[PDB]
Every structure is written in structure tokens, then in C-alpha cells.
Design a protein around this ligand. Structure first.
Ligand code: FAD
Length: 296
């Protein structure tokens, strides 16, 4: 009754009142020095106790207390590993975490509570985990699906999870034969996430995986406009539009809230040519599980 992989789905095994206590096994900065901020890839032990799947999130409760002396409110992070984890044994989970640092209106530097806690983790440290959480970003059941994945920044996370399942693992009950197409938008080359893994998947499975980067501070269209994800999609617009008409095409979008706006402009321009109102047609595709969005 869903087109997505929800059979036996588990949500909310661990709740904030009694989280699962994992251990940090690894934590590595995956961005270079020429990135506006730092993004970190981290691995936690789970003892096989968190039965998550591709597209789900976990909550993290940062150590310490809020200003009223209460445990910190959980923050959600899209799981960056496949169900088996990076080590193929269902005993780890990985996150892709941007360290939040900003300057407020008074001019003071503010550090995000949970993202700085996570990026500062050392191997051996305890981590309080909740979940798994979510059903919107579950993968399509159809092993022959066209899966279009639209990511900005840490929005790559659930797509790393999908792609590990599709291309880096053997699953008797899921032999991917379709077309996975990832668009990843970041500002600089040093901000690219998982470039090596992705480019290996593309060398590995060229018939089944397409990869486009949109490096906005480095690439421009014919008019000289910055190469965001939508700018890159424009170069394949008619093909993307024809793909969307098909019953086995599924679009997923993940990352920074607001990334959906420029994408909508591309889709509006495609749809209007055919006398279709994209703002109305998008609602239909969402209901049909073919337009699946998780932005934050
Ligand atoms: C479903 C889901 C999936 C997510 N997946 C990921 C992921 O894969 N990777 C990842 O890094 N994050 C992810 N996030 C975001 C994550 O949950 C946190 O919101 C993020 O890490 C920042 O939390 P923090 O505790 O560090 O910052 P906080 O200490 O919570 O500070 C952020 C808060 O500060 C306030 N604020 C005021 N001005 C600003 C400003 N200028 N900029 C920012 N905040 C401001 C706002 O109230 C804001 O909510 C996801 C969120 C959701 C909901």
C-alpha cells in the first residue's frame, strides 16, 4: 500500500526519556580548508540494537543541559549509512554533520549546540541516540526504479545510504537495475562530500548511476549565473521532464530549507510549456510518492 520500502518499518524504538547509548568509533572532517564551514563523517557503534533503514533519521541528545537544567532537546540527523552500516555487519551507524557557527544580529558568534557536540566527538565517547525516525525518505520498492536524488550539503546523507544499498552491497531481495541519478549542490570543491565514494560508484556502475555536481561558487551557466542544483538540472530539463511522466520515476530531495525554491522555478518553466501548473502537479506527485522532500 506504499510504493516505498516500509515492510516491517521500525520507528521510535528508543525515546528521549531512555536513549540508546552508543560509542563514537570514528569522526573525520570530510571537507577541505576552502569550505565556508566544516562537515564531519562520524561512525557510532549500535550493537545491532537500532533497526534503521535507508532514508530514516536518528535523534541525538547532546551531552549536558539546556539553560533551564534539562537534558538537551534531540536534533535529528538523516542516517548516512545503509541499514548494514559502513562495515556491513549492522553494528554501526554513520552521520554527516555540518558544524553550525553563525553571527547573530547583535554581532555575536553563536555555536550550534548539537552539531558542535557531534563534530567535537572523540573516539570512545558516549553518544545518546533516539529513533529510528521517519518514513518519507524510504527507498522505492521497485528495483527497476528511476531514482532522482536532489541534494544540497548534508542532504547527501540519505542518498549515501540509498547508494550503498544499491551499489556497494549484495542483497538477494534487492538487485538494483534502474537508474539512480544524483545531483549534489555545494558552494566549493572543498565542500564536496563523499566525492571519492560517489565517483567510484560511477566508475563501478555506469549503466545504473549518473552523477552531477553543482559547485555554485565555481561553475556558471550560458548566462553567467551561479551553478546551483537547479542550474545543473536545467541542462537535462526535457529529459528530467519526460522521466517524471513515467510511473517508475521517484524524486527525492534533501538538504537546506529553501533549496526547493530554485528547483520549483525549473519545474514551473517545464510544466507551463505543456499548460500544466507545477504548483498543483507537485502536490499530485507527492501524494503518489514520486516527489519526496526532507529539507531543514
Ligand atoms: C529531518 C532532519 C534531518 C536532518 N539531517 C541533518 C544532517 O544530515 N546533517 C546535519 O548537519 N544536520 C541535519 N539536520 C539539522 C539538525 O537537526 C540541526 O538542526 C543542526 O545540526 C543544527 O543544530 P544545532 O544543535 O547545532 O544548532 P542549535 O543550537 O539548535 O541552533 C540553531 C537554532 O538557532 C536559531 N538561530 C537564530 N539565527 C540563526 C541563524 N542565523 N542560523 C542558524 N540558526 C539560527 C534558530 O532557532 C535555530 O533553530 C536535520 C534536521 C532534520 C529536521
Amino acid at each position: 500500500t506504499s510504493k516505498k520500502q516500509d515492510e516491517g518499518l521500525v520507528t521510535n524504538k528508543y525515546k528521549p526519556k531512555e536513549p540508546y547509548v552508543g560509542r563514537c568509533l570514528s569522526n573525520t572532517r570530510i571537507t577541505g580548508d576552502d569550505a565556508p564551514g566544516e562537515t564531519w563523517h562520524m561512525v557510532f557503534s549500535t550493537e545491532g540494537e537500532i533497526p534503521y533503514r535507508e532514508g530514516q533519521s536518528i535523534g541525538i541528545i547532546a551531552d549536558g543541559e539546556d539553560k533551564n537544567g534539562k537534558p538537551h532537546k534531540l536534533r535529528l540527523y538523516s542516517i548516512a549509512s545503509s541499514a548494514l552500516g559502513d562495515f556491513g555487519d549492522s553494528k554501526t551507524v554513520s552521520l554527516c554533520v555540518k558544524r553550525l557557527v553563525y553571527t547573530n544580529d547583535q554581532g555575536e558568534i553563536v555555536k550550534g549546540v548539537c552539531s558542535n557536540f557531534l563534530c567535537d566527538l572523540k573516539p570512545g565517547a558516549d553518544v545518546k541516540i533516539t529513533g529510528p525516525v521517519g518514513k518519507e525518505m524510504l527507498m522505492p520498492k521497485d528495483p527497476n526504479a528511476t531514482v532522482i536524488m536532489l541534494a544540497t550539503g548534508t542532504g547527501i546523507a540519505p542518498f549515501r545510504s540509498f547508494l550503498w544499498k544499491m551499489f556497494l552491497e549484495e542483497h538477494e531481495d534487492y538487485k538494483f537495475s534502474g537508474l539512480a541519478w544524483l545531483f549534489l549542490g555545494v558552494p566549493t570543491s572543498d565542500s564536496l562530500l563523499y566525492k571519492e565514494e560517489l565517483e567510484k560508484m560511477k566508475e563501478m556502475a555506469p549503466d545504473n548511476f549518473r552523477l552531477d555536481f553543482a559547485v555554485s561558487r565555481e561553475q556558471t551557466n550560458a548566462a553567467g549565473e551561479k551553478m546551483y542544483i537547479q542550474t545543473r538540472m536545467a541542462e537535462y530539463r526535457e529529459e528530467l521532464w519526460e522521466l517524471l511522466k513515467k510511473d517508475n520515476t521517484y524524486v527525492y530531495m534533501c538538504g537546506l530549507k529553501g533549496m526547493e525554491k530554485g528547483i520549483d522555478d525549473i519545474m514551473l518553466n517545464l510544466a507551463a510549456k505543456d499548460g500544466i501548473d507545477w504548483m498543483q502537479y507537485k502536490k499530485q506527485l507527492k501524494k503518489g510518492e514520486q516527489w519526496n522532500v526532507e529539507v531543514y
